[PDB]
Each structure stands twice: as C-alpha cells, then as structure tokens.
Design a binder for this molecule. Structure first.
Ligand SMILES: Nc1cccc2cnccc12
Ligand SMILES: Nc1cccc2cnccc12
Lengths: 158, 158
C-alpha cells in the first residue's frame, strides 16, 4: 500500500507574466487555489532561464508534462488574446491535452470590434466566438481561472 | 520503376485570410511560387467548412500532414502577430514539424513599442526578438514568404 501517486499538474498559460510584477499576484492566487486540491501549478516563470530558447523549451516541456492547460485568453493589447498563450494552446491541442480557456470579455469578435471589419477593413470572424476560432475546441469558454479550474476538478479526478 | 513519390506540402499560416479578398491575392502568389517547385500549398481556406470546429480540425490536420509550416508573423492589429497563426506555429512545434517564420517588421519588440513597457505599463519582452519568444525556435526570422521558401527548398529536398 505504497503505490505511486500521480499529482495532477496544470500549465498556467496567459499574459499575466507581462504585468509589472511579472505575474506575481496572479500566480500567487493560482498557487493558493490549486494547493487546496493538491494540484501543482506549472508556471511559465518558474526557475526561469536567461536564454529565450531555454525558456521556450522549458515551457513546451511543462505542456508535455501537464494534465491540462488553463489558458487566459483575455484581451491583450487590444481585443486579441496573447500570441504566446495562443502558441501554448496550439502545443497542448497537438499533444491531445485537456485545454481549458477563459477570458474577461466573452462577447463575439464582431461585438468587440463593433463591425464585421476592423479600422483597417480587415475581416473580423463571424462564428459567434470571442476570439480566433483556432482557440476554441468545443469546451465552454469560462469567465475566470476559478471557473475553468472547477471544470478541471470535475473532469480530471485523482 | 513507379515507386511512390512524395509531394512536398507546406501549411500556409498567416492572417492573409482576413484581407478583404479573404487572402486571394496572397494565396495566389503562394500557389504560383510553389507550383514551380512541385510543392503543394496547404491553405487554411481550402474546401472551407461552415462550422468553426470543422475548419479548425481541417487546419490541424493540414499541419499534421505538412512537411513544413511557413508562418506569416507580421504585425496584425498592432505590433503583435496573429493569434491564430501563433496557435498553428504551436501545433507544428509540438508535432516536430519544420517551422519557418517571416515578418514585415523585424525590429525587436522594445524597438517597436519604443520602451520596455507598453502604453498600459505592461512589460515588453527584452530578448532581442521581433515577437513573443515562444514563436522563435532558433531558425532565422525571414523578411518574406519567398525567403522562407528558399530555406525550405535548401533544407527539405525531394
Ligand atoms: N513569452 C514568454 C513565455 C514564457 C515565459 C516568459 C517569461 N518572460 C517573458 C516572456 C515569456
Ligand atoms: N482563424 C481561422 C483559421 C482558419 C481558417 C479561417 C477562415 N476564416 C476565418 C478564420 C479562420
């Protein structure tokens, strides 16, 4: 009765890293929430290397090692989600990982831009989705990290 | 004779799809360039489905089927590349595909934003790269589709 026990792991994707505090406040909240459920956060800035390629490789490895990704696809520098987060969602999708997404703005892209085109006459997607359709996989788009985490707990038990 | 011959295939990732012509002018130029070298373009809008999930699945399948991705990481709706393209680059990276990227703007992110922070005091990466570090894998960032394609021809022969 001392079998190996898998500790669940979630990759914490999102532009919080670009906050003035490098994501400290966001990541601390994540750490506290996950601690209660014995889930390990895999955080992009953990044991951060100095070289871009090393940072990238470590983050890809975290995605490979995770049970799920919870991705913050909130508006970043406009109505579009963060590209880095989008890359990570793509990585996870290719590796058949559970991907859970949330955003602070759930309106359709055309509601966000107020038109079928942006200010430069570039087409805004019309699929009833809050962001680029590649980022949607059929799972509900959540309103917060917490709500996404509740789905994880219900659908990925120990 | 009459052994099976593999036709090389390149997934054409980029926000040209959002042009007023749905990328017609871009894709036509791509088709002509690749035709000369017996390379098949895998284009996001080819045989386009109506449902978001079907379009997504077909595009993921194209990446799975490709020999390389040439991704247009040009500024889209600001200094950041397109998120959908970023997702596709992520997918390709996880699948160990050759990923080739280009941009119309090769300046470092901090040169583009003119500061180490944006207008909202959000951190701009300082790794001497033109975009989010996740999008760089050690291969040169090219100036055009054509220059990326030249690398493909030199590094993925028939
Ligand atoms: N784009 C990025 C991905 C993963 C970690 C990072 C840490 N600092 C800046 C940018 C990052
Ligand atoms: N985001 C997208 C990915 C692949 C194909 C598309 C076609 N139209 C709009 C958006 C697309």
């Amino acid at each position: 009765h001392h079998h190996h026990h898998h500790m669940r792991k979630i990759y914490i994707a999102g532009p919080a890293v670009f906050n003035p505090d490098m994501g400290a406040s966001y990541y601390n909240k994540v750490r506290e929430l996950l601690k209660k459920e014995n889930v390990m956060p895999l955080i992009p800035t953990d044991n951060e290397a100095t070289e871009a390629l090393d940072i990238r490789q470590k983050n890809i490895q975290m995605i490979k090692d995770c049970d799920a990704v919870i991705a913050d696809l909130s508006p970043f520098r406009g109505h579009e989600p963060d590209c880095g987060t989008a890359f990570e969602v793509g990585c996870a999708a290719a590796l058949n990982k559970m991907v859970l997404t949330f955003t602070s703005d759930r309106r359709n892209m055309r509601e966000k831009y107020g038109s079928g085109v942006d200010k430069d006459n570039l087409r805004v997607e019309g699929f009833g989705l809050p962001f680029n359709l590649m980022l949607y996989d059929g799972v509900e788009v959540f309103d917060s990290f917490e709500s996404a985490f509740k789905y994880f707990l219900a659908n990925f038990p120990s």
